[PDB]
Amino acid sequence: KNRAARVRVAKGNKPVSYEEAHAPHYIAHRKGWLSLHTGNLDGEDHAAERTLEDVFLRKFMMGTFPGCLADQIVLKRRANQVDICALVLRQLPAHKFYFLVGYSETLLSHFYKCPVRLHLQTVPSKVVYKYI
Amino acid sequence: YYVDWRMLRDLKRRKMAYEYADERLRINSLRKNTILPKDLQEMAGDEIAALPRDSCPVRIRNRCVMTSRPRGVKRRWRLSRIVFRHLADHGLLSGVQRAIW
Amino acid sequence: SRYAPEFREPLIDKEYYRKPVAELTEEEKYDQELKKTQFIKAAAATETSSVFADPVISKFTNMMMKGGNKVLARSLMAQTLEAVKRKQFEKYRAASAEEQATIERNPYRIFHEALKNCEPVIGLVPILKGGHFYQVPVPLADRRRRFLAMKWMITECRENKPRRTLMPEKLSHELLEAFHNRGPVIKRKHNMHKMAEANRALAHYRWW
Amino acid sequence: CHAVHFCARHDWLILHIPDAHLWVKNCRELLQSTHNKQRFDQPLEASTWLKNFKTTNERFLSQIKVQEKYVWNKRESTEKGSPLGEVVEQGLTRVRNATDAVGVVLKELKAQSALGLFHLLVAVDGVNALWGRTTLKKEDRTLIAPEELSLVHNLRKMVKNDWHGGAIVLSLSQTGSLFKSRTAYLPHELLGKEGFNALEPFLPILIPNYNPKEFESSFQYYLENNWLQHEKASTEEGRKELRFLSNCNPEQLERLCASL
RNA sequence: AUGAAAUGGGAAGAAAUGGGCUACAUUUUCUUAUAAAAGAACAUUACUAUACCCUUUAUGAAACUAAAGGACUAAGGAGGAUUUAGU
Ligand SMILES: [K+]
Numbered sequence: 001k002n003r004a005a006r007v008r009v010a011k012g013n014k015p016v017s018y019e020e021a022h023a024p025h026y027i028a029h030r031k032g033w034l035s036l037h038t039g040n041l042d043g044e045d046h047a048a049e050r051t052l053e054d055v056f057l058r059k060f061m062m063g064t065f066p067g068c069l070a071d072q073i074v075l076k077r078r079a080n081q082v083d084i085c086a087l088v089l090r091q092l093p094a095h096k097f098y099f100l101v102g103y104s105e106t107l108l109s110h111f112y113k114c115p116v117r118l119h120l121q122t123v124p125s126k127v128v129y130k131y132i
Numbered sequence: 133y134y135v136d137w138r139m140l141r142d143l144k145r146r147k148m149a150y151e152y153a154d155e156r157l158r159i160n161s162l163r164k165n166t167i168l169p170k171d172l173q174e175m176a177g178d179e180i181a182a183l184p185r186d187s188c189p190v191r192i193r194n195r196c197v198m199t200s201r202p203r204g205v206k207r208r209w210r211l212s213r214i215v216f217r218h219l220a221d222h223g224l225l226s227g228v229q230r231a232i233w
Numbered sequence: 234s235r236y237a238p239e240f241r242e243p244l245i246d247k248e249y250y251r252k253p254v255a256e257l258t259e260e261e262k263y264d265q266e267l268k269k270t271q272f273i274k275a276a277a278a279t280e281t282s283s284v285f286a287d288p289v290i291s292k293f294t295n296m297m298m299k300g301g302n303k304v305l306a307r308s309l310m311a312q313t314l315e316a317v318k319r320k321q322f323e324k325y326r327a328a329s330a331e332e333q334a335t336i337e338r339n340p341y342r343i344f345h346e347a348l349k350n351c352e353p354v355i356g357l358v359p360i361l362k363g364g365h366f367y368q369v370p371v372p373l374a375d376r377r378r379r380f381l382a383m384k385w386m387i388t389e390c391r392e393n394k395p396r397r398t399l400m401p402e403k404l405s406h407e408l409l410e411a412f413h414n415r416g417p418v419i420k421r422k423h424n425m426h427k428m429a430e431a432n433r434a435l436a437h438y439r440w441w
Numbered sequence: 442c443h444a445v446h447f448c449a450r451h452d453w454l455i456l457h458i459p460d461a462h463l464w465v466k467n468c469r470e471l472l473q474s475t476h477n478k479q480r481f482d483q484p485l486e487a488s489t490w491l492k493n494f495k496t497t498n499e500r501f502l503s504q505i506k507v508q509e510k511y512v513w514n515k516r517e518s519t520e521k522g523s524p525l526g527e528v529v530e531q532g533l534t535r536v537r538n539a540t541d542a543v544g545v546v547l548k549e550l551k552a553q554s555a556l557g558l559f560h561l562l563v564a565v566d567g568v569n570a571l572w573g574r575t576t577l578k579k580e581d582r583t584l585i586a587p588e589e590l591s592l593v594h595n596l597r598k599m600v601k602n603d604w605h606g607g608a609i610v611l612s613l614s615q616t617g618s619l620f621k622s623r624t625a626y627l628p629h630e631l632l633g634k635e636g637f638n639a640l641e642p643f644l645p646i647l648i649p650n651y652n653p654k655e656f657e658s659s660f661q662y663y664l665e666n667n668w669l670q671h672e673k674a675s676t677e678e679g680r681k682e683l684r685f686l687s688n689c690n691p692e693q694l695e696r697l698c699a700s701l
Numbered sequence: 702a703u704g705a706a707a708u709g710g711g712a713a714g715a716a717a718u719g720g721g722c723u724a725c726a727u728u729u730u731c732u733u734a735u736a737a738a739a740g741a742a743c744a745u746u747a748c749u750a751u752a753c754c755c756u757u758u759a760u761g762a763a764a765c766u767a768a769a770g771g772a773c774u775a776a777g778g779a780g781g782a783u784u785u786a787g788u
Pocket residue numbers: none
């Protein structure tokens with residue numbers, strides 16, 4: 001049996017999002033890619049550095065927004081610009097988000113020497129694709 | 133902190149080979165030819181031997197940057213097969229999909 | 234297979250299509266109309282309307298081919314037919330007018346009548362009854378009877394020949410000897426039949 | 442071979458080289474030459490040619506007579522005036538001198554032909570071998586060149602137009618040629634730059650494929666001898682099929698009909 | 702110190718067994734072409750070692766590694782019970 005990235009069946013009480021529901025073989029078929037850069041295209045360089053930066057950027061956002069992330073973040077690289085698009089629950093006060101956005105942008109722009117912007121779409125609660 | 137002590141030794145091997153690259157190039161050039169007297173080549177053969185062993189660039193091993201696994205690594209991403217599959221199977225690698233054909 | 238079960242085997246008979254409509258039996262006439270609404274398999278690379286194409290000889294060629302070397306296997310068959318035509322022309326020229334009449338100089342007709350002389354009517358199937366191997370007389374189909382004659386020829390020549398003799402020289406010498414009912418391939422048929430008489434009473438064990 | 446028959450019947454002296462590729466490959470005995478130590482001697486190749494040259498020109502081997510003295514060995518020599526047959530006889534008797542008897546024969550006939558005693562047809566088939574490459578190796582495992590060989594060197598003189606009293610008939614053959622493509626037939630492609638310059642000015646005679654009249658004549662000849670034994674061969678659809686597969690090429694038609 | 706670092710070593714069978722490679726050749730061997738065709742070879746060393754050994758070259762600081770030649774030849778003459786794969 002294959003176990004990779006597969007949320008298993010229980011008794012029909014486990015909420016799963018659209019991203020979680022689909023196993024790896026649905027990548028490029030039903031669900032797209034969370035990161036979009038040019039480093040895995042044919043004849044392109046610096047794939048290892050884009051991949052390492054993404055791993056860190058995901059751990060950073062999880063810790064900086066603990067319990068406030070509704071789904072996995074989406075990373076979009078254009079030129080030297082980095083764009084982080086995160087679905088965030090409406091738990092924290094509004095002014096706290098403005099603090100964490102200013103902090104997380106400045107800190108990650110001085111760490112990777114690129115302009116980094118954070119895009120936050122607030123949801124009332126996690127969106128459930130199906131109950132499995 | 134690096135992943136383990138094996139990755140730490142490799143990092144030092146990579147930083148000492150960079151310092152001695154020009155030196156080991158200039159000396160080794162004197163040996164890889166047939167135009168110079170063999171006495172000079174025999175003496176250059178020992179000057180290169182006297183350099184520290186960690187300067188030698190064949191003692192570098194490519195290890196997974198995240199788990200320090202010596203074998204199973206893919207050179208384009210610098211990750212082991214186990215670590216690569218975790219990022220790929222979750223949609224986190226840009227443009228990597230499963231191969232159905 | 235890449236062909237769906239709804240595909241039909243092609244019919245590569247030139248005269249069949251050009252026959253007058255009235256000359257065709259209504260059964261054949263019906264099939265042609267049906268085939269107009271069906272899918273037809275593409276013809277094989279070796280399937281042609283050539284007047285010189287013989288299915289029996291083409292099949293014998295494929296049973297000699299090794300590792301997909303069709304050029305070599307076809308060359309060996311071409312050399313064999315020629316070696317048989319040249320062997321009968323020598324005999325015909327060096328024979329009296331009376332003897333000349335009997336001599337057959339068609340290699341294609343020597344091959345067909347040779348094979349038919351080697352075909353066995355009955356074969357044997359190996360059976361293990363009560364932990365003992367018994368072979369029961371069987372009646373051979375038209376397909377099994379033809380296969381065995383060609384298989385027995387290609388095996389006598391491949392193995393039981395001198396080291397420096399060549400297949401066009403052993404096969405030609407065997408087609409002609411079978412054509413006269415004297416060869417070792419004919420002897421294999423005689424042994425198979427004789428054994429069936431020995432096991433005549435053991436056909437009951439058949440379950441198929 | 443048609444020209445060699447015409448001259449043979451008019452009492453010409455036939456110098457017919459059946460295949461010239463055989464002298465630049467697959468030699469199992471390659472000695473050195475006393476006349477010139479640089480050159481090599483092919484004993485078996487020369488001996489076979491002499492035996493055939495003797496048969497064809499046996500009549501003229503007594504009339505023609507040597508104009509010089511040839512010392513085969515310390516104990517054996519040819520006195521001036523003796524019949525040319527003696528030179529041929531010694532070559533067959535003593536294989537060591539075979540490659541040199543040939544050279545004497547070629548030299549004598551070329552010189553004496555101008556005297557009006559006889560005509561000389563130099564018929565070399567496969568002439569492109571002379572000015573090409575070889576597949577023979579020296580004791581150092583180094584490939585030899587055509588000029589080095591004794592038989593090749595002598596022949597290159599006979600195909601020159603510096604004599605008179607005869608005609609030279611040459612033929613090109615890519616079959617058996619070394620280091621030439623399968624689809625090369627034109628004179629420069631096969632002869633090369635060295636071979637072309639050697640033979641010019643020459644008269645090129647194109648041998649094409651069977652024309653419609655020639656194809657039918659060849660088809661009827663096979664039917665006249667009962668060669669085409671297949672039942673469908675005599676029919677109009679058989680003939681048309683053989684015309685397509687052969688493409689009117691004489692060799693392809695002969696091979697296809699052989700199996701049929 | 703069961704932690705850290707340095708230097709030098711981590712051997713050996715030829716013995717059983719699993720898998721693979723190559724060969725035992727004539728539908729073959731070598732050469733040119735190109736798998737067409739031709740010329741030679743074809744049993745005592747003909748077919749035939751990617752072993753041992755001997756040279757040269759490539760990588761490296763290190764050849765113990767790999768490749769390319771050279772000789773040298775051994776065994777091998779289509780493999781018992783049994784067994785693998787292919788629609
Ligand atoms: K073993």
